[PDB]
Amino acid sequence: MLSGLNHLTLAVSQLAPSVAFYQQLLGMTLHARWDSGAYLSCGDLWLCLSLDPQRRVTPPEESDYTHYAFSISEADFASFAARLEAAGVAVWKLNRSEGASHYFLDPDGHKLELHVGSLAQRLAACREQPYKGMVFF
Amino acid sequence: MLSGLNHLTLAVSQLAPSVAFYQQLLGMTLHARWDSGAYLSCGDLWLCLSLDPQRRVTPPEESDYTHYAFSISEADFASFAARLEAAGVAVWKLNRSEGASHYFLDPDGHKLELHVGSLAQRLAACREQPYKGMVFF
Ligand SMILES: CC(=O)Nc1ccc(C)c(Cl)c1
Ligand SMILES: [Mn+2]
Ligand SMILES: [Mn+2]
């Protein structure tokens, strides 16, 4: 059957600024870069950046809620978020509707998130503060 | 420091067909559902389906190359691809790279992939046959 995300591929309009964002600003590990892409890792995540002439720099009001959240510890969360803010990284959401999260945009407007906590922890939190109509299986 | 992918959230136009697709067709585990979304798991992947009236059912020619690949073993790949074909799931690309890949669309046009092979396998193949402009770190 299916087991896990094998990789996340993000289309990017300008390869070098996107590599710099994920590697320098977010601290991911850069493994390889070529004329039309790059491979990075973030823990066990394989991230591919793919140069795509069709990728548009998209304001967050023009895209849907699809987004990619990266894990960070409770001890590191606030200083990492504050560093992104001080660096001028654009945001897209403020209301913490799914726990301790910071919502920010990549250079092309991909919707990203820093989040503290696992699915199990979110389910436990939701039992006390459930989403409207929530059922647990 | 970021330690991995925390969750993938897909905006969906209709929650019921999206739950059927990810849970019943793709075999992911449904943990919770509420009026406007659902939480599933696929191995270590935490998947959130978020009901979003801004989600358009998007033909593949009208979206960029951003896509989400799920891991499957080589032994299971062909029968899973056949299952998707029997279900009438559209393909958006043919495989021309190393490692088996099946490129298929979700009900809203999210670009998905089944892939066999890790980042390490891809890097080993690339070292033997580097892409144009390829540099390793
Ligand atoms: C022309 C040029 O400067 N290319 C270049 C710069 C930095 C990196 C990391 C790479 Cl692979 C290539
Ligand atoms: Mn999220
Ligand atoms: Mn892929």
Numbering used by the authors:
A (entry chain A), B (entry chain B): 1 to 137
Give excerpts from the publication.
Fosfomycin, a broad-spectrum antibiotic, is routinely used to treat urinary infections. However, natural resistance can exist in gram-negative bacteria, mainly through the enzyme Fosfomycin-resistance protein A (FosA), that catalyzes the Mn2+ and K+-dependent glutathione mediated inactivation of Fosfomycin. Therefore, increased interest exists to identify inhibitors of FosA to enable the use of Fosfomycin to also treat resistant strains24.
For comparison, the same screen was conducted with conventional single crystal data collection at cryogenic temperatures (100 K) from loop-mounted crystals at beamline P11 at PETRA III. In contrast, 31 fragments are observed binding in the cryo screens, but only 6 of these bind to the more interesting sites 1-4.
